Amino acid sequence: KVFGRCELAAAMKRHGLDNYRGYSLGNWVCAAKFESNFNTQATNRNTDGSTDYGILQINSRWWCNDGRTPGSRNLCNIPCSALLSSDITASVNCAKKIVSDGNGMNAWVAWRNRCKGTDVQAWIRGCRL
C-alpha cells in the first residue's frame, strides 16, 4: 500500500508517534517519505546480507527475522514479512524500540540526511490532525 501524506500522518499520530521521545510527527512522516516514499512493501537489500523492510525500512540484522541474515537477532520478535503489511502497527511498535536504542532517530539514515535540522513541520501541512 502507498499512503497519502496526511493519511500516513493520521495513522502515525493514532499509533502515538507524535512527540514520541521528543520527535514531532513531522519527523516521522519525513523519515517515512525518504526511507520508503510511503510504500509499505518497500524493501532494500544491503551488502552485508541484511535487508531493510517496510515503510520505515527496519533492518533484518537486529530487529526482525527474515531467516536469511547471518548472526541476526530478532529484538522486535517478529518476522520481517510482518513489516510489509498495509497495517503499520508492527512497524510502529518496532520503531518505538529502535528510536529508544541510544541513537534517537539517527538510526534512520534517510532521516538524518534529509530531515534532521530541517523545518519538518512542513510535512504535516494540509493535514486535519
Swiss-Prot record:
Annotated active site:
35, 52
This entry carries the following GO cellular component terms, namely: cytoplasm; endoplasmic reticulum; extracellular space
Which top-level enzyme class is recorded in the Swiss-Prot or TrEMBL entry?
hydrolase
The Gene Ontology biological process annotation of the record reads:
cell wall macromolecule catabolic process; defense response to bacterium; defense response to Gram-negative bacterium; defense response to Gram-positive bacterium; killing of cells of another organism
Tissue specificity here reads: In the egg white and polymorphonuclear leukocytes.
InterPro entries, sorted: Glyco_hydro_22, Glyco_hydro_22_CS, Glyco_hydro_22_lys, Lysozyme-like_dom_sf
Entries under PROSITE patterns matching the protein: GLYCOSYL_HYDROL_F22_1, GLYCOSYL_HYDROL_F22_2
- Superkingdom in the source lineage: Eukaryota
The chain's disulfide connectivity reads 6-127, 30-115, 64-80, 76-94
Domain (C-type lysozyme): residue spans on this chain: 1-129
For this UniProt record, the keywords arranged alphabetically read as follows:
Allergen, Antimicrobial, Bacteriolytic enzyme, Disulfide bond, Glycosidase, Hydrolase, Secreted, Signal
Name one molecular function that GO assigns to this entry.
lysozyme activity
The answer to keyword Chaperone applying to this record is no
Q: Does the keyword Cell division apply?
A: no
Q: Which SMART domains match?
A: LYZ1
* SUPFAM superfamilies from the UniProt entry: Lysozyme-like (SSF53955)
Q: Where in the cell is it found?
A: Secreted
Reaction(s) the record says it catalyses: Hydrolysis of (1->4)-beta-linkages between N-acetylmuramic acid and N-acetyl-D-glucosamine residues in a peptidoglycan and between N-acetyl-D-glucosamine residues in chitodextrins
Q: Recorded E.C. number(s)?
A: 3.2.1.17
What family classification does the UniProt entry report for this protein? Belongs to the glycosyl hydrolase 22 family.
Self-association or partners: how does it assemble?
A: Monomer.
Role played: Lysozymes have primarily a bacteriolytic function; those in tissues and body fluids are associated with the monocyte-macrophage system and enhance the activity of immunoagents. Has bacteriolytic activity against M.luteus.
Write down the PANTHER family for this protein, in alphabetical order.
LYSOZYME C
- Name of the protein this chain belongs to: Lysozyme C
The organism of origin for this protein: Gallus gallus
Q: What is the lineage of its organism?
A: Eukaryota, Metazoa, Chordata, Craniata, Vertebrata
